[PDB]
Specification:
Chain F: Its cofactor is heme b. The structure is cut from a larger assembly and holds seven copies of chain A. By secondary structure, chain A is an all-alpha fold. Chain A contains five helices and no strands. At the E-F interface, helix 5 of E face helix 4 and helix 5 of F. The structure holds protoporphyrin IX containing FE (4 copies).
Chain lengths: 155, 155, 155, 156, 155, 156, 156
């Protein structure tokens, strides 16, 4: 059986993935509705990536004889325009990585090194998303909003 | 022999398709003349799609032993710039979908379910065109008119 | 800008093409409705050919800074049986070639040699259609109406 | 579980399909026996098409927990010559589409939209058959009977 | 012209084939509905084989200048569970082969050797079906009903 | 062309049902995989994917109609504790889903939103196919016994 | 021998082609130097097309037993920025087509129909270049100069 606090941490990370799946999927379809197809496609792939993380977390929790929690869905940060949507994704990711670091600390302490390795792989993927997000927000500043949107119309 | 009012409704839809064929073809060639080749190509494909709908309507009318009316051509809405042309297409499509809905109501009432199915397929295609048009008009607001035209110069 | 009377002549030829498109398309679908698929298929190709001429005329008018007229649709000559439909097509083409010759005369007078060359190419296509029509009407006389229809049932 | 009257309508349409299978299959083989191979082949495909509709109806009735009725075979309309055979097929199809419309009305009323969609697909196929049949009868008038039969001796 | 009693015999065998087509097709679709897909698929192929026999019988009757009887449909033996359905198929086949033998005797007596050969080919197919049916009923005894059904779940 | 306000409410209701089914079927899939019932785990995975695709189409339709898709409200997951309960939980969810779909289609018809009706009818056919699978599986447990049924679903 | 005035007209058109070859080639390389590679590539192709017209005129003059004049090079219209370069090309083409029409009139008058056909083919190609140039100048007005240049930085 797994450590009770490891399973709590894994369920907390899973909860964050479930928010991100839905937030990124809606943002993707919003961008597609507006004709910003390059943003819509990239955001769809971000949503798929979170779906795959959730899958791996669910599988680990079950192996450890815990109960995966897919019932509690936290608050989606839905923006009303491109700049707010990107900032909402970044705010979500900054919370996501804080929780990941706390979970890894606990895994190391109780010697659950396989759970730590899984979380470290998720953390790397979220830091890559932060890299993308900070880059997009900087580009809006460097080229202007209307030029940035123009750049993201075509796939 | 088909229901007389069904044939009248089908000839009304056909009349709307005939307006749309010519309006979209002219808009296409105006955009090509101006060097906005992406818009010209998309609009050509819209005109072709209306040609295919008119064909299916003609065939259905003849099967029902009615007389297809290709003689009466209503008013083309020709715009003077890119935004107005898109808005003219949208005004035409909003009228077309109203007429399609009224035609479908009558087909259902007289149990002409095959005519209804044909009209619903056309209606879905016209709503996809509305989706394109509202998206383009929204992009003009979001990226600016000159940027929008810039994006539609090359195929 | 193009010559004002050249553009009027090009719009007149365009109007003739627009009549022919619809007349041949309806005749095609009537023959298909009747199971005369060889005639229906041939007439369909005649309609497509007039569509392509209309396109070239629209493009030339716009280059010359004129306004293509797709709004005014003249009288369709719709037959009620095969022999009448063929004679109607022949009557329309004889009017078309008369107008083409008058347009070519004017283009030569004002030295619009490229418009003349475009119109000469259309004229050759219309004379090929006259060749087909006169041949079909001659076959009806040579084999009889029922044998002619029999020959045109299968594609 | 399915609506009882929906299941009754579906079995009624199934009964019509079972008549058409047999009528078209026999007309097909009669035309082949006479050397009118183009007619025989087309009529064979109409029979196969009805077999597929009957299959989908059987499958739907079973899903809805009804009993498919393959026991009751109504009256086959068999012609004695080509012109009669085509009119017999047309008469059968006109009855079939009347029954299809009444079944669709009832499915709509009780919100069985999937059964309605199946019946609408069958109806489109039967109306295509009416188009073929009315066209053939029109051709007999336009070219004459002997020329029409001549046109249908060889297959495509 | 064919012998009158040969034509009666052929119409009787055809009548048996028409029963089997419907009985096997219904049994096939019942097994599919229950998820016994191996039984459903095999029973489908049995129905198709009887359809082909009916076709050969119809063609022979017409060649002999008889009237094929597709109007009279005898009693379908429909079971309520797998063991009853298999026994119903066997009962039908035992009657079918009895009738086939009587038809062959009469064909031999009147020297209709081509009709005899066709009927013998059908008889061989029906005995192959009896072999299948007796083998399945024996397997139910040897492995038990639940194991037998388990074996026929997957195609 | 703004959507009917009640149409958008119905579409958001169906979307909410799809979101429950995605999570319920995904968890059931991974439970069956954890238990080594790989054939059930794989089939249930594909059911979850199918609901994801329906949710996508509903989100797209709502946005086109200028509504706000609701991905925030997640209703109650019906999670079973063994194979037979899990299948019955899926079936209970699907019966509720098809009831809501029928009511949404009724309203779409009333306000002449025929494209939304067609989308919902396509989803309805897919959910009725899932009901077919589930009722068949529960019938097989009764026909072959629970242990034989589980044995049959160990290997993919 | 050919008609003396026909040969003079053909040499006049040849002279116009020789100006255009050099003007378009230099404009092409100026655009490439500035990093406006789409304009540079298009203008290179315009220069090649004029070289091919010059070739056909030389061949026709020699067949007619005239002397092709490749010695006299008239005034190149070289712009100092993109907008001036396009207008310089347009000014040259409007002069070229005027001379082409005058040459065709004369060929018709003396019944040199093959020379007329050659000149009409050149005229169609020059009117296509006018179409391109007017469209580009219009695009500058519709998108603004900086956006137009932006659109022409990268080749296809
Ligand atoms: C202003 C009037 C029209 C113009 C300028 C026009 C132009 C065209 C052109 C350029 C094509 C492509 C031909 C090719 O290159 O193969 C085409 C195709 C076609 N047109 Fe038209 N057309 C017109 C009216 C119509 C009408 C009134 C109908 C029917 C009633 C129609 C039916 C069709 C069909 C069925 C095709 C083939 C589409 C496909 O399957 O790809 N057209 N048309
Ligand atoms: C007089 C009765 C029938 C005759 C003579 C007949 C004849 C045939 C024949 C010759 C074939 C083609 C077999 C092959 O060579 O592959 C066929 C196929 C088929 N039959 Fe029948 N049939 C009859 C009744 C039925 C009935 C009552 C049904 C269903 C309720 C049915 C369902 C089917 C199906 C589903 C196929 C396969 C069609 C395809 O997918 O191509 N048949 N039939
Ligand atoms: C518990 C939440 C979810 C989980 C665990 C999950 C899991 C997955 C997985 C594992 C895949 C396959 C990824 C791959 O390897 O390519 C997938 C695909 C997909 N998901 Fe999800 N998903 C969830 C929620 C959602 C939601 C809420 C939506 C839409 C609103 C959605 C839409 C999609 C779509 C469109 C695909 C691609 C399906 C295809 O076309 O093949 N998913 N999901
Ligand atoms: C003055 C009279 C000229 C004539 C009659 C002439 C003729 C031609 C011809 C016939 C071609 C081949 C075209 C083809 O079919 O692809 C050609 C190619 C070419 N020309 Fe000229 N040309 C002339 C002047 C020039 C000048 C002044 C330049 C440069 C400053 C030039 C640069 C080129 C280049 C780079 C090619 C392509 C060579 C290759 O890479 O194959 N030409 N010319």
């Amino acid at each position: 059986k797994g450590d009770k606090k490891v399973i709590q941490h894994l369920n907390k990370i899973l909860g964050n993935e479930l928010i991100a799946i839905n937030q990124y999927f809606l943002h993707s379809r919003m961008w597609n509705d507006w004709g910003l197809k390059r943003l819509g496609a990239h955001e769809y792939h971000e949503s798929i990536d979170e779906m795959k993380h959730a899958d791996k977390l669910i599988e680990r929790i079950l192996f450890l004889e815990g109960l995966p929690n897919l019932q509690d869905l936290g608050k989606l940060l839905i923006g009303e325009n491109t700049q707010e949507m990107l900032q909402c994704d970044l705010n979500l990711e900054l919370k996501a990585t804080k929780d990941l670091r706390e979970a890894i600390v606990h895994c190391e302490q109780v010697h659950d090194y396989v759970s730590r390795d899984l979380l470290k792989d998720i953390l790397e993927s979220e830091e890559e998303h932060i890299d993308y997000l900070e880059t997009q927000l900087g580009l809006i500043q460097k080229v202007g909003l209307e030029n940035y949107l123009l750049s993201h119309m075509h796939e």
